[PDB]
């Protein structure tokens, strides 16, 4: 069901996208973490906003390519959602149209400026929030 919250699993390292109460963004492997339960919502065809249920904040990508979670919705909080031929999802900034939401093998996010269409760091698999 599309309206149900989800966890976003990153193929790179197997980390779940996490949004902390104070707005920090990273990844973690513990499926039990309460800060990985996310709520996606379409703003227009193929474009979504990603909100951390616990932190009550919205994922966003800044001008320098850094990721953070905002209390209020801004134009840096919307991403083109695409189901790739490999069956994984990608999230591309509608503002900075060349950068992708991504995680590093370490578990720390990856600068949007360092992302590309063929990278393993931009591939996510939406999963149920149990």
């Amino acid at each position: 069901h599309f309206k149900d919250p989800k966890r976003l699993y990153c193929k790179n390292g197997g980390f779940f996208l996490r949004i902390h109460p104070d707005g920090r963004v990273d990844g973690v492997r513990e499926k039990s973490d309460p800060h990985i339960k996310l709520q996606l919502q379409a703003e227009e065809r193929g474009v979504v906003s990603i909100k951390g249920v616990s932190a009550n904040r919205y994922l966003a990508m800044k001008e320098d390519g850094r990721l953070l979670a905002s209390k209020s919705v801004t134009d840096e909080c919307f991403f083109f959602e695409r189901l790739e031929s490999n069956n994984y999802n990608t999230y591309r900034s509608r503002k900075y149209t060349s950068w992708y939401v991504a995680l590093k093998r370490t578990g720390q996010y990856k600068l949007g400026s360092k992302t590309g269409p063929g990278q393993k760091a931009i591939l996510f698999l939406p999963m149920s929030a149990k």
Partner: protein
């Protein structure tokens, strides 16, 4: 020198949970060293994993200390353990596998909804039921088009599938459409309001 078995590359073993889309190939590895050369065995849910345990069985490449399963399906979900041993020791590691089915279709609506409605001068509703893998965007349109309501941060999916119209006028009569779209395509069903 003679020694018990040991992992030769823990880096490739850190990812414990392997969540993958259905129909893909999965490969688990447990690179090991030891003298004499240790043997390798794979368990599924703590028990011997046999070829007949899944359609098409599996493949093992001892040279790469790997277990390979092609075209995974939901039923493959479970734990897979590698046991490595020689005369001086025995060690193991466990991976968890989860399979997710992806649906590359445009949104699909339930037939019959919304349904035609007839009123008088005082309430009515139009219901819509949507299904989609890729996040769908739903809106209600009145026929030259006019957007009555559209999904978004300020109008969540929780209540977007039902359109309420109270104290109707003769002007409200007409064709109403529930339109759903995702990155792949668009779908829509219409109903008529008779006043």
């Amino acid at each position: 020198n003679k020694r018990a078995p040991y992992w030769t590359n823990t880096e490739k073993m850190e990812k414990r949970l392997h969540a993958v889309p259905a129909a893909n190939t999965v490969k688990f590895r447990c690179p090991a060293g030891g003298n004499p050369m240790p043997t390798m065995r794979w368990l599924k849910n703590g028990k011997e994993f046999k070829q007949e345990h899944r359609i098409g069985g599996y493949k093992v490449r001892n040279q790469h200390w790997s277990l390979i399963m092609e075209s995974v399906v939901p039923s493959d979900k479970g734990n897979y353990t590698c046991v490595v041993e020689n005369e001086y020791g025995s060690i193991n590691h466990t991976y968890h596998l989860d399979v997710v089915e992806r649906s590359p279709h445009r949104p699909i609506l339930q037939a019959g909804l919304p349904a035609n409605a007839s009123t008088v001068v005082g309430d009515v509703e139009f219901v819509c039921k949507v299904y989609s893998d890729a996040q769908p965007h739903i809106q209600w349109i009145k026929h030259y088009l006019k957007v009555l309501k559209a999904a978004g941060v300020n109008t969540t999916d929780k209540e977007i599938e039902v359109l309420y119209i109270r104290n109707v006028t003769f002007e409200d009569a007409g064709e109403y459409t529930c339109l759903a779209g995702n990155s792949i395509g668009i779908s829509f069903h219409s109903a008529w309001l008779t006043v």
